Write a protein that binds this ligand. Structure first.
Ligand SMILES: Cc1cc(-c2noc(=O)[nH]2)ccc1-c1cc(=O)c(O)c(C(=O)O)[nH]1
Ligand SMILES: [Mn+2]
Ligand SMILES: [Mn+2]
Length: 176
């Protein structure tokens, strides 16, 4: 699979390994579910990028479940903020709120409703597309123009890379 080769070549090994771990532990093979693998990596990278543009953010996504919940509990105990039912992706120490990060091959409003419906919580939601569109709750985009622009550019580059290798048509039809 070119798709597996693309993944190993466009994401850095820590991300690839983190994505592989999370698939394999749940009995999913990244050489078979190659679109899912590419999606997990993409989303991981966005979460890491989002975190890196701030010690403003706590990274929750990408840790094992014990650690993610340890981090969430520890944030809750010290800030007082409500404990989410689902593991979010980051915590924002400036805005004092969790963030759910969405990356979608579909329209941002569509994916946004899917997320908000799933955590109907007082978690902030920020959706990115592979087209440069974003949507965030209350149109509050958390980051500055430049950090958002780097995320959008990276996502658009992944898409175009996939398109170079004729993987994009498959990739975008494999989301809900
Ligand atoms: C990135 C991803 C991909 C899939 C997926 N399954 O088949 C695919 O093509 N993608 C399912 C869930 C998730 C996912 C998305 C999120 O935004 C997210 O916060 C999580 C999470 O588990 O915390 N998982
Ligand atoms: Mn997550
Ligand atoms: Mn997410």
């Amino acid at each position: 699979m070119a798709m597996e080769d693309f993944v190993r070549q466009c994401f850095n090994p820590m991300i690839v390994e983190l994505a592989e771990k999370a698939m394999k532990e749940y009995g999913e093979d990244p050489k078979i579910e190659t679109n899912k693998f590419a999606a997990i990596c993409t989303h991981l990278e966005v979460c890491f990028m989002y975190s890196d543009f701030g010690h403003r953010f706590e990274i929750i996504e990408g840790r094992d479940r014990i650690m993610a919940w340890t981090v969430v509990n520890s944030i809750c105990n010290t800030t007082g903020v409500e404990k989410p039912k689902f593991l979010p992706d980051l915590y924002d120490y400036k805005e004092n709120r969790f963030i759910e990060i969405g990356v979608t091959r579909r329209e941002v409003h569509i994916y946004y409703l899917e997320k908000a419906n799933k955590i109907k919580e007082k978690t902030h939601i920020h959706i990115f597309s592979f087209t440069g569109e974003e949507m965030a709750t209350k149109a509050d985009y958390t980051l500055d123009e430049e950090s958002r622009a780097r995320i959008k550019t990276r996502l658009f580059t992944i898409r175009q890379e996939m398109a170079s290798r004729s993987l994009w048509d498959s990739f975008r039809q494999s989301e809900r």
